[PDB]
């Protein structure tokens with residue numbers, strides 16, 4: 001959904017994150033659950049990373065003539081994890097975790113007609129979480145948590161074929177016969193395909209809490225309600241356009257030129273809040289199944305507006321996403337004291353309504369198809385590894401004067417090691 005990242009755990013990548021939040025064992029998925037802590041005897045530490053290899057493609061042709069084919073844009077993705085849940089007494093316990101539930105790819109050559117809206121896009125996001133939980137009565141446990149999110153981000157864009165058309169158009173209207181437009185055309189042609197049209201980049205922290213509730217029918221059965229707050233990140237970074245300050249103030253699309261000089265610019269990224277009901281059931285000694293349904297009020301992510309020292313708009317862009325559900329169902333098979341198995345189906349609607357899709361964040365309802373294993377070493381430590389396959393229906397896009405077409409597809413590799421004390 002949009003650009004949030006579930007990943008966070010190999011142990012869970014195996015079950016297409018289906019009910020993460022009611023299936024505590026191996027720790028890790030304590031974060032995103034909080035109220036799971038209460039379910040731990042010995043400090044359990046698990047870590048690892050989930051490798052993401054996405055194949056997203058853009059296809060099309062531009063008024064210009066040049067092709068909009070962008071064969072590959074979403075670079076691989078690292079995204080590590082690391083958790084540490086630790087009991088305190090028999091009513092309390094605390095936990096920590098280093099995850100990254102937000103961020104994206106998107107390359108696009110520094111050339112490419114349509115670069116006007118393709119340049120580059122990066123958002124790395126490390127969410128530091130420290131949670132604690134009470135266990136009220138024998139079957140109810142409540143969790144609360146503070147989160148410290150950090151994020152680096154870069155946004156580059158360049159004048160695509162634009163220069164052409166502009167120039168072109170000029171040259172076919174009673175203005176191509178004008179000593180004026182003529183040179184104007186010239187200048188227009190001068191904007192090299194690869195001229196950095198927009199640059200914004202910045203590092204900044206942001207905070208926000210989170211809570212969760214855990215109810216267990218009995219030891220083998222559970223259900224949960226979780227909530228992660230929004231996280232307004234008030235960036236204070238840099239901006240700059242290599243276009244000549246002339247283009248500015250003509251109320252045209254083209255983002256505020258700075259004559260290739262850096263202006264200090266502010267902007268706010270709203271990482272969305274999210275709710276999630278979940279359930280776990282150990283039907284039979286070896287077999288257990290898990291539900292899951294999540295809400296990510298993406299509605300909060302309305303725009304990427306970037307302002308200046310003097311409070312003017314430097315670079316804006318409508319996003320107007322809308323709420324989205326994500327459903328998941330997976331099961332686990334505990335063969336014997338050493339091995340453990342899992343498999344999952346997961347689906348979720350794209351937060352971005354067609355009216356606003358963008359080659360920048362080509363998003364489309366994603367379908368998950370995963371399964372993995374867990375080789376226990378000795379009642380104390382183990383290793384988690386699972387693969388995931390997400391394929392989605394290629395959808396149409398309409399940005400600027402360009403008509404695109406984008407196809408999504410991607411694989412996942414997970415590996416985790418976890419020890420106990």
Ligand SMILES: CCCCCCCCCCCC[N+](C)(C)[O-]
Nearest residue numbers: 077079100103104105124361362
């Ligand atoms: C802290 C690690 C950050 C790794 C950056 C992760 C990039 C994942 C790529 C997501 C881009 C895909 N798409 C279609 C959703 O925009």
Ligand SMILES: CCCCCCCCCCCC[N+](C)(C)[O-]
Nearest residue numbers: 123153155200201202237304360
């Ligand atoms: C001053 C740096 C500002 C960049 C931080 C904003 C990153 C937004 C990344 C996700 C949305 C990207 N997009 C399509 C709106 O350009």
